[PDB]
Each structure stands twice: as C-alpha cells, then as structure tokens.
Amino acid sequence: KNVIATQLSEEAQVKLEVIQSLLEPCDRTTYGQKLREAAEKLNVSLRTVQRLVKNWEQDGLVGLTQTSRADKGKHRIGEFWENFITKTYKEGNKGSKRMTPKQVALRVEAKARELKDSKPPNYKTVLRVLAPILEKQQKAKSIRSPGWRGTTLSVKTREGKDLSVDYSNHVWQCDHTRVDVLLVDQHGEILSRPWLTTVIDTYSRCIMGINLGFDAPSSGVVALALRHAILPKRYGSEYKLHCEWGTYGKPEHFYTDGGKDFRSNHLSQIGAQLGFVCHLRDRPSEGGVVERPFKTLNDQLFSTLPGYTGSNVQERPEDAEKDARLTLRELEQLLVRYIVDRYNQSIDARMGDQTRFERWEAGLPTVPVPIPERDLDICLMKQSRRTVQRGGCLQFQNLMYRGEYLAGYAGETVNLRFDPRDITTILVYRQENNQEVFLTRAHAQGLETEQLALDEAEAASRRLRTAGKTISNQSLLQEVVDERQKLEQTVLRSAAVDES
C-alpha cells in the first residue's frame, strides 16, 4: 500500500538533508566513518543513526518522520466509561429527545456515585468522547448530490417505475409554492401571499406556463395552468415584452407532486381527454426540476420586491406588511416579464450550448397540433352517475335546469360538463354505443339576465337551507347575491379576456 509523507517540517528537513548526504554511495568501511558527522548534527549517538538508516531504508520518508503515539485517540477512562458515554448519549437522543454532552456528564456522575467510583470522567472528558459522534453525524447532514449530466435523463416515479425523458413535451411537471410576496388589493390592504403553480418541461428545463393567484392548490388552479401551458400565447402591448413565449402544445406525460388536486378526478379526466398520463413523484428530490426553479425565482425575483416575506418565519423581515405595495396585476407582469424576456433565454444549466427556449423548440419530437381553445373548455369538470329527468329538465347541486333535447329521453343515467366559473349552462353527454356522445347544452330555469359561478352557488346553499327557505333555483340564486375571498376573487377577475 502506498503511503506518502506530508507536513515535512524543518526538523524533518534537517534529518532528511543528513540522510541525503549519506545516500551518496561509498565503501561500507568509510560509510560507517563518514556518517559520524551526524552525531553532533543530531546530538545523538550513531546507534540512533543506525536506527534512522534502518527506518529510512525500510520505510522511506514516512518512517523517517515520527509516528503518532499508540495511545492517540485512546481514552484512559477505559472501555466501560467510553461505552457508557456513547450508549447514554445515543439513547438520550433517540426520537425527539435531544440530550447534550452536559446532560450526559450528569448521568456519568450519577452512575459513578452508584458505583462508588472514586474518579469518574470529567465533563470535558465526556465532551471529548462524543466529539467523533457529533462530527460524524454532522458530515452526514451535508452531502452534495451529483445531479444528472448531459442529455440523458430518467425520472423515478412513486410507482417504482423509472420513466425516461426523451423529447420536449414528453414529460411536463407541476407543483405549487406560496409566493414570498405580500401584495395588496386596489389601493391596497395587506391581503396575503398568493400561490404559484408552474408547468416545467423536463426535457428542455423550459417553462411553458404558470398560474399565479390567491387560490389554494386546487384542480381548477392546475386546470387553468394547463389552459395557459397548452394554448398559444399572446400578451398585450402593455407588457411591452421583447420576447414571445412561443411554447405551446400538449404533453405525453404530466409528472407531479402527488398533491390532492394532482391526484384529483378532474385532472384524471383531463388526462383521458388530452392523452397525457399522470405519474406520481416518489420523494421530493425527484421533483427537483420543478422544486429548484422556486429557489431560482425566489432569489432572482421575489427577494427584490417590496412585500418580500423571507424564506422562513425565523428569517421573516418585519417590514413586509408595512409596505407591501404590488397588486397581482403588477406581480403577474413582473413574473411574466422575468420568464419571457430573461428565463426563457437563460442558458440551460447543464447543456451550455443553448437557451432554455431552444432546447424546447429543437427538442420536441415533432411540431404539435395547436388545439382549438373551446376544446379545452369542453375539457370541463364533469359529474357522473347522475340521472336525467323524464322531461325537458335537469338538476345540479340544487340548481334546476332545462334542456332542449332531453324530452326525447326517459329518466336515465347521464353525464354532464360545466364551467365552475360559468355554471349558467351545462353540456350534457350520453353513453351511446358505450361511447360518450353529446346530448345537448342546457340552462338553469329562466336564467339568462345574469351569470352565476359554482363556488358562490355552493355557499348560498348553506345559508339557503339553514334559514328554512323553500329550496329552489329561484331562492338559491338570491342567497348568491343577497371580505378576504371577495377581495381575492375580484382581483382574479382582472383577466386577459378583457385585454387581448
């Protein structure tokens, strides 16, 4: 086994230079006579020089240097007390308990009093014995992970199956983060931090879309992100963007955090209707392609904005609610500009050759089909195992409904699709030849002068029934129209359909 000498000292150089001065060969009878100069040079007898030669000719520079002692790192308290210390500390720190070396020393002293030990380990002896344990568990805390390199990648799934990522749109990802920005309503009281949910192309490391809003992580949020991700992009001249967010088209997979909206029925309906397969993430680390852009985006954007809230409670800067000043119609513009004019053109961290954008456009397997917008708005939420009435009429969530073509059918199991943001109308479906086929569009009885949303109609049904009101669509509609979420929802009302 190779061992190399290190930390060659001055005294080792003195000892080495005389050794080198006797490495020069000569006859052994003068050899044993010229080495006599070492005697006063080292202040020791030639018998030590003979020993030094025996070391150096045996061991080289390593044995020419002095070793550590045989007792280095050996504790003279003996195996009982060194066992006792490491036993006591490790059992005292199991689970949530967090004993400390000072607490251990009290145990040592206690046991010694029981043992009548005349001289138990001092606290600093107990502290010394644990220093290897503390250090070894410290190094185990911070081990770097290599990360993937080059074009080849595969993503582990909670199924256990590992799924290769082969071309752009092969595997999208999403998760939600709570934005670190307090931002405010019109004129502006503090409201609260929004959520950000992002679609990330695992091949290009590109980012095809986001939903930003106060809405909690929900299937309507994920659906509205995909509605953004999948469509062609057009942003108004009021953004004054330099770059166009040309990423569109549809995934072959959607790989995601296992959040309850990602595990929802509604999204699975989208999976069937758009052809992607939902795959679950095994552990958070496998998500890193989307976990990390929150770190990247926090650092490069949110930390510079007035309402910044810090990375943790323990770092929370106290001015955040004192001068939060953006509204979401500005934070949208900030985030959208950051993505489209910077992040899209930023270099992909392990390719170097090209931007994030060009690894999308050059990496997709072929040019995807740009779908009609109305088709995703036919990919609405659906309800099933309901029944059509034996007439021209329908029901949903205590609303009551009419339909143009339903009268041709007796009462039978029906499927229906609805916009939760415009429950004024429903699209109705029938199981013809074991296939979903359109029945008709439908409307609430007499409802045309105004439009209704699902969330407010659900809330109205609570105050409707508890007051003992006669249950009907007529009375339910009044309890819709007769606040934190009101401010939040009326901020989200600001939308590009009025602006494009």
Partner 1 sequence: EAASRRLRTAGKTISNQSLLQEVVDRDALVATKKSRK
The rounded radius of gyration (Å) of the Cα atoms in the chain is 37
Q: Which residue has the tokens 């990919």?
A: 379
Question: Among 37, 82, 109, 361, which residue sits at the site for partner 1 (rule: CB under 8 A)?
Answer: 109
Per-residue x/- mask for DNA, residues 202 to 241, rule CB under 7 A? ---x---------xxxxxx---------------------
Task: Please give the structure tokens belonging to residue 483.
Answer: 């606040």
Residues 318-377 that bind Mg ion (CB under 5 A): none
277, 253 in Cβ contact below 8 A? Answer: yes
By the rule CB under 8 A, 330 interacts with partner 1: yes
Task: Please give the structure tokens belonging to residue 65.
Answer: 């240097």
Beta bridge partners of 426: 418, 442
Distance CA 128, CA 125 (A): 5
By the rule CB under 8 A, 93 interacts with partner 1: no
- Which secondary-structure segment (H or E) carries 80? helix 78-92
Main-chain phi, psi angles of 105, to 5 degrees: -60, -35
Distance CA 62, CA 3 (A): 7
By the rule CB under 8 A, 155 interacts with a copy of itself: yes
Binding-site size, a copy of itself (CB under 8 A): 49
By the rule CB under 8 A, 90 interacts with a copy of itself: no
Which CB atom, from 369 or from 478, has the smaller least distance to DNA? 478
Question: Among 92, 258, 271, 368, which residue sits at the site for a copy of itself (rule: CB under 8 A)?
Answer: 92
Q: Which stretch binds DNA (CB under 7 A): 148-156, 332-340, 372-380, 446-454?
A: 148-156
Distance CA 253, CA 238 (A): 34
Binding-site size, partner 1 (CB under 8 A): 34
Which CB atom, from 333 or from 489, has the smaller least distance to DNA? 489
Q: Which of the listed partners (a copy of itself, partner 1, DNA, none) does 342 bind, with a CB threshold of 5 to 8 Å by partner kind?
A: partner 1
Q: Which of the listed partners (DNA, Mg ion, a copy of itself, none) does 413 bind, with a CB threshold of 5 to 8 Å by partner kind?
A: DNA
Question: 257 among the known binding-site residues?
Answer: yes
Using a 10 angstrom Cβ sphere, with 0-12 exposed, 13-18 middle and 19 or more buried, the burial of residue 280 is: middle
Q: Which of the listed partners (Mg ion, a copy of itself, DNA, none) does 233 bind, with a CB threshold of 5 to 8 Å by partner kind?
A: none
Distance CA 386, CA 160 (A): 36
Which CB atom, from 9 or from 300, has the smaller least distance to a copy of itself? 300
Helices marked H in 93-200 — which ranges? Answer: 101-115, 123-139
Beta bridge partners of 386: 414
Q: Which of the listed partners (a copy of itself, partner 1, Mg ion, none) does 341 bind, with a CB threshold of 5 to 8 Å by partner kind?
A: partner 1
- 398 dihedral zone (left: phi>0; alpha: psi -120 to 50; beta): left
Which CB atom, from 229 or from 426, has the smaller least distance to DNA? 426
Per-residue x/- mask for DNA, residues 380 to 419, rule CB under 7 A? -----xxx--x----xxxxx-----------x-x------
Q: Which SS3 state, helix, strand or coil, does residue 428 take?
A: strand
Cβ contacts of residue 13 below 8 Å, gap of 6+?
none
Q: How far is the CB of 369 from DNA (least distance, A)?
A: 28
Distance CA 450, CA 364 (A): 44
Question: Among 14, 26, 44, 110, which residue sits at the site for partner 1 (rule: CB under 8 A)?
Answer: 110
Q: Residue 345, Cα to own-chain centre: how many angstroms?
A: 23
Question: 175 among the known binding-site residues?
Answer: yes
Distance CA 121, CA 114 (A): 14
Main-chain phi, psi angles of 209, to 5 degrees: 170, 160
Helices marked H in 186-338 — which ranges? Answer: 219-230, 265-274, 288-300, 328-337
Distance CA 260, CA 220 (A): 12
By the rule CB under 8 A, 305 interacts with a copy of itself: yes
By the rule CB under 8 A, 330 interacts with a copy of itself: no
Q: Among 48, 119, 50, which residue's Cα sits nearest to residue 80?
A: 119
Q: Which of the listed partners (Mg ion, a copy of itself, partner 1, none) does 257 bind, with a CB threshold of 5 to 8 Å by partner kind?
A: Mg ion
Per-residue x/- mask for partner 1, residues 111 to 150, rule CB under 8 A? --xx------------------------------------
Interface residues toward a copy of itself, by CB under 8 A: 92, 95-100, 103, 145, 148-151, 155-159, 161, 163, 279-282, 285-286, 289, 299-300, 303-310, 312-314, 317-320, 322-324, 350-351
List interacting residues with Mg ion (CB under 5 A): 175, 257
- Kindly list the residues in this chain that would bind partner 1 in the complex (CB under 8 A): 106-107, 109-110, 113-114, 187-188, 240, 242-243, 301, 304-306, 322-326, 330, 333-334, 337-338, 340-342, 345-347, 352-353, 355
Per the annotation, binding residues are: 175, 257
